[PDB]
Design a protein around this motif. Sequence first.
Motif, PDB file in Angstrom:
ATOM      1  N   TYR A  96       0.826  -1.193   0.000  1.00 59.81           N
ATOM      2  CA  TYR A  96       0.000   0.000   0.000  1.00 59.81           C
ATOM      3  C   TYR A  96       0.867   1.252   0.000  1.00 59.81           C
ATOM      4  O   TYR A  96       2.001   1.258   0.482  1.00 59.81           O
ATOM      5  N   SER A  97       0.314   2.323  -0.563  1.00 61.92           N
ATOM      6  CA  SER A  97       0.971   3.620  -0.483  1.00 61.92           C
ATOM      7  C   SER A  97       0.783   4.249   0.889  1.00 61.92           C
ATOM      8  O   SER A  97       1.694   4.904   1.404  1.00 61.92           O
ATOM      9  N   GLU A  98      -0.387   4.054   1.495  1.00 63.52           N
ATOM     10  CA  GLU A  98      -0.698   4.757   2.732  1.00 63.52           C
ATOM     11  C   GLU A  98       0.286   4.415   3.839  1.00 63.52           C
ATOM     12  O   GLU A  98       0.649   5.287   4.634  1.00 63.52           O
ATOM     13  N   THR A  99       0.726   3.162   3.914  1.00 56.48           N
ATOM     14  CA  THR A  99       1.638   2.785   4.985  1.00 56.48           C
ATOM     15  C   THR A  99       2.938   3.573   4.904  1.00 56.48           C
ATOM     16  O   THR A  99       3.505   3.947   5.936  1.00 56.48           O
ATOM     17  N   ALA A 100       3.430   3.835   3.694  1.00 60.77           N
ATOM     18  CA  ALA A 100       4.658   4.612   3.566  1.00 60.77           C
ATOM     19  C   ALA A 100       4.478   6.016   4.127  1.00 60.77           C
ATOM     20  O   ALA A 100       5.353   6.524   4.839  1.00 60.77           O
ATOM     21  N   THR A 101       3.348   6.655   3.827  1.00 60.02           N
ATOM     22  CA  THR A 101       3.096   7.990   4.357  1.00 60.02           C
ATOM     23  C   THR A 101       2.976   7.968   5.873  1.00 60.02           C
ATOM     24  O   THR A 101       3.470   8.874   6.554  1.00 60.02           O
ATOM     25  N   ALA A 102       2.307   6.957   6.422  1.00 55.46           N
ATOM     26  CA  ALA A 102       2.201   6.863   7.872  1.00 55.46           C
ATOM     27  C   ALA A 102       3.571   6.682   8.505  1.00 55.46           C
ATOM     28  O   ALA A 102       3.863   7.281   9.544  1.00 55.46           O
ATOM     29  N   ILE A 103       4.421   5.849   7.904  1.00 60.24           N
ATOM     30  CA  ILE A 103       5.766   5.665   8.436  1.00 60.24           C
ATOM     31  C   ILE A 103       6.521   6.982   8.405  1.00 60.24           C
ATOM     32  O   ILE A 103       7.189   7.357   9.372  1.00 60.24           O
ATOM     33  N   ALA A 104       6.435   7.701   7.287  1.00 59.48           N
ATOM     34  CA  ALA A 104       7.137   8.973   7.194  1.00 59.48           C
ATOM     35  C   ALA A 104       6.652   9.951   8.253  1.00 59.48           C
ATOM     36  O   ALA A 104       7.466  10.613   8.902  1.00 59.48           O
ATOM     37  N   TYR A 105       5.339  10.051   8.452  1.00 62.75           N
ATOM     38  CA  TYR A 105       4.815  10.940   9.483  1.00 62.75           C
ATOM     39  C   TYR A 105       5.311  10.532  10.861  1.00 62.75           C
ATOM     40  O   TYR A 105       5.880  11.343  11.597  1.00 62.75           O
ATOM     41  N   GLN A 147      -0.160  -6.760  10.298  1.00 56.30           N
ATOM     42  CA  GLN A 147       0.031  -6.568  11.732  1.00 56.30           C
ATOM     43  C   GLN A 147       0.836  -5.313  12.040  1.00 56.30           C
ATOM     44  O   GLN A 147       0.723  -4.771  13.149  1.00 56.30           O
ATOM     45  N   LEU A 148       1.638  -4.838  11.085  1.00 49.72           N
ATOM     46  CA  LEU A 148       2.406  -3.622  11.303  1.00 49.72           C
ATOM     47  C   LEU A 148       1.492  -2.440  11.579  1.00 49.72           C
ATOM     48  O   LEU A 148       1.767  -1.624  12.467  1.00 49.72           O
ATOM     49  N   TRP A 149       0.407  -2.319  10.813  1.00 45.34           N
ATOM     50  CA  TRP A 149      -0.500  -1.204  11.031  1.00 45.34           C
ATOM     51  C   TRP A 149      -1.093  -1.251  12.424  1.00 45.34           C
ATOM     52  O   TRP A 149      -1.203  -0.216  13.082  1.00 45.34           O
ATOM     53  N   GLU A 150      -1.479  -2.434  12.896  1.00 46.88           N
ATOM     54  CA  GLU A 150      -2.021  -2.541  14.244  1.00 46.88           C
ATOM     55  C   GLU A 150      -0.987  -2.111  15.277  1.00 46.88           C
ATOM     56  O   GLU A 150      -1.274  -1.292  16.163  1.00 46.88           O
ATOM     57  N   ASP A 151       0.230  -2.645  15.172  1.00 43.41           N
ATOM     58  CA  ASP A 151       1.249  -2.324  16.166  1.00 43.41           C
ATOM     59  C   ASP A 151       1.513  -0.827  16.203  1.00 43.41           C
ATOM     60  O   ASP A 151       1.556  -0.213  17.276  1.00 43.41           O
ATOM     61  N   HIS A 152       1.681  -0.213  15.035  1.00 46.28           N
ATOM     62  CA  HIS A 152       2.041   1.196  15.025  1.00 46.28           C
ATOM     63  C   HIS A 152       0.855   2.085  15.342  1.00 46.28           C
ATOM     64  O   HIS A 152       1.042   3.183  15.870  1.00 46.28           O
ATOM     65  N   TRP A 153      -0.369   1.646  15.056  1.00 46.09           N
ATOM     66  CA  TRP A 153      -1.504   2.412  15.535  1.00 46.09           C
ATOM     67  C   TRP A 153      -1.538   2.414  17.047  1.00 46.09           C
ATOM     68  O   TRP A 153      -1.819   3.445  17.657  1.00 46.09           O
ATOM     69  N   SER A 159      -1.184   5.782  19.177  1.00 49.31           N
ATOM     70  CA  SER A 159      -2.312   6.104  20.037  1.00 49.31           C
ATOM     71  C   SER A 159      -1.883   6.311  21.478  1.00 49.31           C
ATOM     72  O   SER A 159      -2.363   7.240  22.137  1.00 49.31           O
ATOM     73  N   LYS A 160      -1.001   5.458  21.997  1.00 52.97           N
ATOM     74  CA  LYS A 160      -0.591   5.627  23.385  1.00 52.97           C
ATOM     75  C   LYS A 160       0.206   6.911  23.564  1.00 52.97           C
ATOM     76  O   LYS A 160       0.014   7.635  24.546  1.00 52.97           O
ATOM     77  N   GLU A 161       1.084   7.228  22.614  1.00 54.36           N
ATOM     78  CA  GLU A 161       1.909   8.421  22.758  1.00 54.36           C
ATOM     79  C   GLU A 161       1.095   9.695  22.597  1.00 54.36           C
ATOM     80  O   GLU A 161       1.602  10.787  22.867  1.00 54.36           O
ATOM     81  N   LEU A 162      -0.141   9.586  22.159  1.00 48.02           N
ATOM     82  CA  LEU A 162      -1.027  10.740  22.105  1.00 48.02           C
ATOM     83  C   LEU A 162      -1.842  10.892  23.342  1.00 48.02           C
ATOM     84  O   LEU A 162      -2.683  11.792  23.397  1.00 48.02           O
ATOM     85  N   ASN A 163      -1.623  10.039  24.339  1.00 51.62           N
ATOM     86  CA  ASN A 163      -2.439  10.017  25.551  1.00 51.62           C
ATOM     87  C   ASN A 163      -3.892   9.678  25.224  1.00 51.62           C
ATOM     88  O   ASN A 163      -4.823  10.421  25.541  1.00 51.62           O
TER      89      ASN A 163
END
Lengths: 134, 1314, 417
Positions: B308-317, B355-361, B365-369
């Motif tokens: 997917y393209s979206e995962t690359a953008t999420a990683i970059a962000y 599973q990468l998307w789940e882990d990084h979400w 999410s936790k680091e956003l409180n």
Amino acid sequence: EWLISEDWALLQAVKQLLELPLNLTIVSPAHTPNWDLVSDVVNSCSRIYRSSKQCRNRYENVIIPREEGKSKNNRPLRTSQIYAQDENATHTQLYTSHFDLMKMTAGKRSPPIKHASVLAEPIQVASLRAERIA
Amino acid sequence: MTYIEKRFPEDLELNAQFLDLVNYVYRDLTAKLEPAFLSGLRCAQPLIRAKFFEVFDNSMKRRVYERLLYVTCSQNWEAMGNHFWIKQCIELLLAVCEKSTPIGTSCQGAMLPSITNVINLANQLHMLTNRHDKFLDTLREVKTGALLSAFVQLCHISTTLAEKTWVQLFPRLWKILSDRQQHALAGEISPFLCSGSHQVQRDCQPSALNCFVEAMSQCVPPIPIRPCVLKYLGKTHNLWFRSTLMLEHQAFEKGLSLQIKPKQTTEFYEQESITPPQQEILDSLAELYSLLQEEDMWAGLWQKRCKYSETATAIAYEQHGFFEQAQESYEKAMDKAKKEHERSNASPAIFPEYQLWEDHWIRCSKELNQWEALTEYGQSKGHINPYLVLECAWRVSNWTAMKEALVQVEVSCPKEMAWKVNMYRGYLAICHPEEQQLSFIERLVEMASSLAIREWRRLPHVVSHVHTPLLQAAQQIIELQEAAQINAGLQPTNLGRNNSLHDMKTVVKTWRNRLPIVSDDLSHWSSIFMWRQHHYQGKPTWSGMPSSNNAMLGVHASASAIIQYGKIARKQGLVNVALDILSRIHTIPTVPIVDCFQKIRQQVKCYLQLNECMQGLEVIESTNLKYFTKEMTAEFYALKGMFLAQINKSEEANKAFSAAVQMHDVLVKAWAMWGDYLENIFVKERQLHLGVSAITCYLHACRHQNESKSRKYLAKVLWLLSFDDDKNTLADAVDKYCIGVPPIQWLAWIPQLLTCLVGSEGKLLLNLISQVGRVYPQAVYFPIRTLYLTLKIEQRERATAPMWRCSRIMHMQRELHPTLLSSLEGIVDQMVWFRENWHEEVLRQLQQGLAKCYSVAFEKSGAVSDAKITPHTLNFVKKLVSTFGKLKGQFTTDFDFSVPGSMKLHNLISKLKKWIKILEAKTKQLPKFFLIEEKCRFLSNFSAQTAEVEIPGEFLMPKPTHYYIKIARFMPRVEIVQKHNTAARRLYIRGHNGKIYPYLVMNDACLTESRREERVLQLLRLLNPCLEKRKETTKRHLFFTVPRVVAVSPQMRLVEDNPSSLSLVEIYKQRCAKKGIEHDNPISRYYDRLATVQARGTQASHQVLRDILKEVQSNMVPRSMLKEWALHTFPNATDYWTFRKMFTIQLALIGFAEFVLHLNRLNPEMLQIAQDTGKLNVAYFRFDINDATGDLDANRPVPFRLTPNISEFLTTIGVSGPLTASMIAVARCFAQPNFKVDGILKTVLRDEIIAWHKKTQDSQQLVSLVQKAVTAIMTRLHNLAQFEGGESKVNTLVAAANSLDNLCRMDPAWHPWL
Amino acid sequence: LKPHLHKIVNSSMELAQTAKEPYNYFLLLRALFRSIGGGSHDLLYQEFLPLLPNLLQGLNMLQSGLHKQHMKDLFVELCLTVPVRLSSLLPYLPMLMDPLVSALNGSQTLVSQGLRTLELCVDNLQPDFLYDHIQPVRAELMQALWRTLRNPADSISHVAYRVLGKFGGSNRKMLKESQKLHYVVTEVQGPSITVEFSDCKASLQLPMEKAIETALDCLKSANTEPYYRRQAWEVIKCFLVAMMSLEDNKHALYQLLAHPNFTEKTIPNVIISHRYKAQDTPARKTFEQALTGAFMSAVIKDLRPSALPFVASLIRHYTMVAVAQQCGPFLLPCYQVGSQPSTAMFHSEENGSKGMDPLVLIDAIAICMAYEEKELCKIGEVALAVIFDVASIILGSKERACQLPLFSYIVERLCAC
């Protein structure tokens, strides 16, 4: 709760890494079985890890009966056939359910949300610099 | 047999007799005592060991293959524990070697020749002859059995000898075997490694398996190994870096690249399989990177395989923060994947990408409180994850889920994560749902610490990010114990007691200071602050009834914790979560007024840092209905003033500043912003009488603040200075109001101070330099020496007011510190003895000429082969013979050069080349060693008694710390060394602290040229501090590593140095001398083939340029030289990896600095790499400015050096991971409007352009030109710091740098092939 | 004890600078520090106070030298444990950092003492201030701390981890220096010995650079089992007999040693100096290490009975080859009548010195002379005497033996110590 994915993963791991008979007959002494290696490889794709204790337990309690074929499970097809058949169901459903659940969580709660002296006027701008010293 | 040893190991004899009996029995199934027999083979007493080995050696055949089999299949090594059986392996293998042969070697080059040998090369004496014969005979009959029998003993006693001997022996043994049997053994090695019999060796640091894998890595036919087993080995046996290197080698040779997946998997038909092979090797390697916290390398891997393209953008962000955006990008990625899976197959290939998307979400999410959301998700209705709930539920008020969520976790027993659960038990033990007696927590904390140390002992030897979790845990473990003590102090017997009242105050004061750093993710900070907040909430409950301030102490602690947590949240950019955290404070009914002031200050800062102007007004004007405390009334007045400044409000902001200064005058930021506003006014419609306001404001700001957070205002001052007119009223204001600003600040601005002093009416400014020199003699002296001597040289080659001022300072501060000045002059005058002999004098000029003429040859590349030497180069050639024009050289050079320097350029170049060759070859006979004692005196006698002098260069950067190191003694030796364009001598200083500090005394001409390099070095030095104020930069340890250089004299200067430092061209030189050619062949081929193509009436064409690059890279400059050198110079994997990573990190900053600041191009020799640490420093960049005009532009083909021979060493993943991330992070950091990066450039460049104006012909013209030139920097920065759909321009230009279509047309002197 | 405390301190410090056994002054200084401290004092601390700026600075200078191990341990021990309370020691805090760092790299006692002191100051020194004063040496202090956690003595590692935790984020804040990496500078390998098998009639070559380094370490060590000493000397002897040729007969040696031009012809004045030596190439480095080990074997008892008769003949052969190369009918060109201290004298990668040059023997002698244990001088002098004796025997007169170039190297190398 364990699925066919883990079963096939650990079966193939034991079959092809340890190069050992399925009955764990140690053909030569140096190559004893290692269950932490199998635990790692199986955890590499499982949703939640499980101790090598549980890996060997699953092996002994399911796979050994399952593979033999003479078990009274209506002559089972062994994990190979089940793994070949169920490419979609588990993989797709588990992850799709997780994604939907956490989308609902994102929606949940909410989509995230005078004085001692004053008013000299501006003559004070320059004079005050020095005047305030005393 | 197995009882005698385990509980009675202290014996040495009873064990001896028992092992004797065991040894006897095996000479007569009852042969089932193998554990005891093997324990016997590892006995300490040599005779017992020999007796056991005697039989052990007859249980085999006298062959090598049989014994190699035996140690791999027919033997179980689980019997022995922490032993290192490779010793017995070596014994058994060497046992088959011959023993009756006379010794011999193949090292004929290291042999000692016989006495009679000299003939072949072409009566006491008689008694000596026979006495020698009877010794020669007894030395003639020795046989190798002696050496073999003894070598193994040393192997026994020493582990390191054993392991290195095994590593060096196993590959050699491998070659002995024929392929018919090598393959058979290799087939069964892999079973050997996976065997569980080696599990016991897990915690042995030099594990007998680690050595075995290391040894096999060298077998000349690469032994195959499963790509999955390697991950496990790296996990357990501490083979992390070696495993990763093996996996990388397999990936970049087996798949030849990443599974780049240019298109959708439904059409990406080249997938290797549904579970592709050559894709497990990618996933295992990715997991290794994730474990090692090498998040940048991991991202560089995932941005090159993702479907997917979206995962690359999420990683970059996520990789650069912006967590709020990363979360949503992940959510949309999951949504898009779901809408396909609802009518599509699973495609097991994208399991990990799923599973990468789940882990990084979760991570985002936790680091956003979002803790409550994470808890609810963890306790999902189905598919529950317990560990997430355990981690999160205790931060939130809940105290039941974690109580439950432990029972299933404990049975899961995640070893290598075991310390966390033991630590977590304590949290319940203290904040128990009902209560706990908390007396046993000591055992919990000690067990946790012990297990954490045990885990540490298995991580690599050199600290990196991988060790961050443990160093991060230590604090929270000790804080758990600390809170346990306080709670024990809260028992009803101790509750309310003065002794406890003391302990609680001590602990709160301790906590209010021991904090993490800004490079720790907000999750960790949340852990600490919520753990503290729990107990802070505890105290008010009991003191909630005496005017007990204890409740007030708890209130203060909790409010401070909240405010500090929100403050750091803001510091990292998450203003929204910071707003929520700060707004939480409203829940407290009673709060100190100062805490309310801090709350409103933080909220208003949040508003400023994102606009919400009317909220900023309301949040201020809504306060102080009758009276808040008096002091911060200025604070909100200044904040309102700067709000009114952000918006177009002008005079009410002026009234705001006037009020803010109205009471106490000490609010620094009020002065800073008032000065900023006044300067913004003054930049146009001067009305210069208004101008004094800005200088007054900045000077007032710097009066109170000191040693830092001040340099920006000093830069503003030195910039506004240039606006002063003939009626120098700004100088008048400086004199009238610069009173009392400490001299320590000015040290950073010495060169600018001097260059402004040399200008008109500098006499008024001379007061400040006098003041500084009076306090810091050594700092201003050497610069004054150099500048005064420069004026003396110039006015003489072409007594003057500038020289008059310089002397007026030098001989004024001579009155003070006469001893120090005398000592410095003594050192400098002695240093003249370091002049070089005629050879080096000639070679320096020849090198300069060769560089100068190759520059032109490139300038005339694609043109006449008969190009002519320019008048400047011909003048240099004339000067050569003039200054030099021993018999043969004096004869030959004077006819090969001077006027004969005319005519064909490409023949003069060949003559220069051969002259260089001959002279350099003759230099070999020079001594490489000489002492201080001879030919120079005063340095040797130097000692701390004479006078205290700081290590040359300690004053290059002011510091409130004392930090100063004195000279203790000059070492008795100095070394002559080669270098890029000189052979400057090296001398060793010894500081008062006992450390050695090597130094180089370099002499150069063209002083005006040389004085720009230290200017750019000053800019780099002054910029480094800002890299420490941001998370994204600190995370990766980014710094410019500027060396230290001081201008002793115009002709020569001192510079710090370290041995083992060498430049790329040096490595090329080594590997070229390893073959039968010289180093200049690449340029030779380039130019000759271009000339031959040209000779057929054909103009230079892109295609032939690419062809020449490709061919020269193919035949004489293979790309692997750099990697191969790194391989043979770092044969230890951990060193290799750390060196490579540090190399890439530094090269990123080098490239960024070269581009953004329009610097000179980076030649090979210009780059120096430290073998000891892998740090990089450049050979003195300089601003690139056109002779015709000071427009300050640099538009070379490639924005910075990324030669292929470097890229292949860095590999594709590195060049796309760390480099791009580091460059983007730096660009983001400097773009901050908070940092006044304006002035730090608008002063340095104003100084710089004068160097151009002087080399070729002082009013507002200079102001306008520097203003223009800085905007070039500003544009080239902003246009790679912004984030958008193309996340950064960096992607474009990093690809440009390595593109063949931009390297092949680079100057061949620039070595695009190397 | 109040009076003349200053004397026992200052005079002891001054006198210790010059004496054949300075050990005792520092010993009694340690005793004084222990006794005067530990709360056995009210006014003694007040009397001690003015001594700090001089005594502490002196000890800080002292511990930075290259003294023998026990002396260094004593210096670092003295520098810590100075009888002063935690407070009021702040002004002199910066000048005990380096001793503190040195302690963490010493023996278990030193490590424990260093950690004790570090924690003691950490607990009550307002971390901001402590970090301000720790900044100068943090780069090395943190490396020492991180290294201690690998210490097998868990009682050390646990304290080290507690200390690391006591620091806030500072326990990991960016270090301005990376850790030193090891690297190999030579692109060539060391010597090797032939070992052969009947299997496919092949032969095997194995290295022993590290082997001989370990043997040398064992001989140097103060507590190796004598059996291992014998084994190490056996390894060294076999290596040295392997790295020489045993070709010539009685006549071939006699007919040359008895040749004219060994007594009658002049001796060219060929200077030789190590200032023109390129680098200790592995073949020379290992050879020098082996010879130094051999010397350490002759001096040490229970090996002397067999080492000395061997080392003496080794010298008697090395000198013979060295002179035959630089004298007599067939001298080498590098000792030709007109020549300089060329690099051709010494084994170098590109200029193999016609094999291995005998001059390495002199470097071995110089190293063994400069070693910590002066006992080696007794064998070094024996070696020099034997060299002179052999040279004089073959050249016919001591005065002629003195002109031979080898001695030009001998004097320079020995003086270089």
